[PDB]
Design a protein around this ligand. Sequence first.
Ligand code: NDP
Ligand code: MOT
Length: 206
Amino acid sequence: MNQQKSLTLIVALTTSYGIGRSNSLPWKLKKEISYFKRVTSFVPTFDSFESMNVVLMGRKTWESIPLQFRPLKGRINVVITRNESLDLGNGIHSAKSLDHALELLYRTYGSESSVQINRIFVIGGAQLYKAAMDHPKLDRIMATIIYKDIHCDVFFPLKFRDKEWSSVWKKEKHSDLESWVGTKVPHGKINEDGFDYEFEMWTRDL
Ligand SMILES: NC(=O)C1=CN([C@@H]2O[C@H](COP(=O)(O)OP(=O)(O)OC[C@H]3O[C@@H](n4cnc5c(N)ncnc54)[C@H](OP(=O)(O)O)[C@@H]3O)[C@@H](O)[C@H]2O)C=CC1
Ligand SMILES: CN(Cc1coc2nc(N)nc(N)c12)c1ccc(C(=O)N[C@@H](CCC(=O)O)C(=O)O)cc1
């Protein structure tokens, strides 16, 4: 009872691995955020009945979610926090680490629940990305790449797209991405108020 399913990571990072700035998102990518929403909510219709996805985030990302958009709707949220004094949420779990999170869900959401889980996502930030990257169940990176050098204070832990990791991490066909995400997605670059971006799916053999 601990690790059964895979772990998917999802990020928006610039060519230089910058993922944030001043504990915040230094860019307004409203359709980028719809991809996000889209991706993280998607459950196959036949399963659309009992099944839900799980979004894992570090304490800081949680604070970065507008009160308006918290918890993420249609998804099980789990905030990773050691410094859990008292989390504040009506069915918004608090795990002390990534594997603890994973046995809480497995514990709290099994056969005896009218609520199941399909997919689990690590939706950030930096430190949580780090531990996701070392976890033996992480095999897929749903990354959005912005072709703009935006000054970021926090960087993505592993340079997964670079040549040094090019024997592990492979970028899948646009086809594979869409199928996985179940719905069609923009191919090529998407310009949205200044930044040039694009969607990619990286996969690794566990
Ligand atoms: N591009 C993107 O998709 C995203 C970018 N970001 C950016 O990342 C930055 C925040 O990064 P980061 O500072 O790392 O924040 P995180 O959101 O990862 O918060 C880290 C905090 O969360 C808890 N935590 C995280 N990992 C662990 C672990 N392995 N064990 C225990 N507790 C853990 C701890 O909380 P405690 O203090 O309780 O120990 C730790 O201080 C901001 O710039 C944010 O905007 C964030 C999300 C998505
Ligand atoms: C800081 N993070 C991470 C984040 C933003 O964009 C990303 N894009 C990717 N690819 N991965 C990520 N992890 C993120 C987030 C911040 C806010 C929301 C958020 O509010 N989404 C709400 C808001 C709804 C809306 O704005 O439309 C939702 O319901 O999905 C999500 C993530």
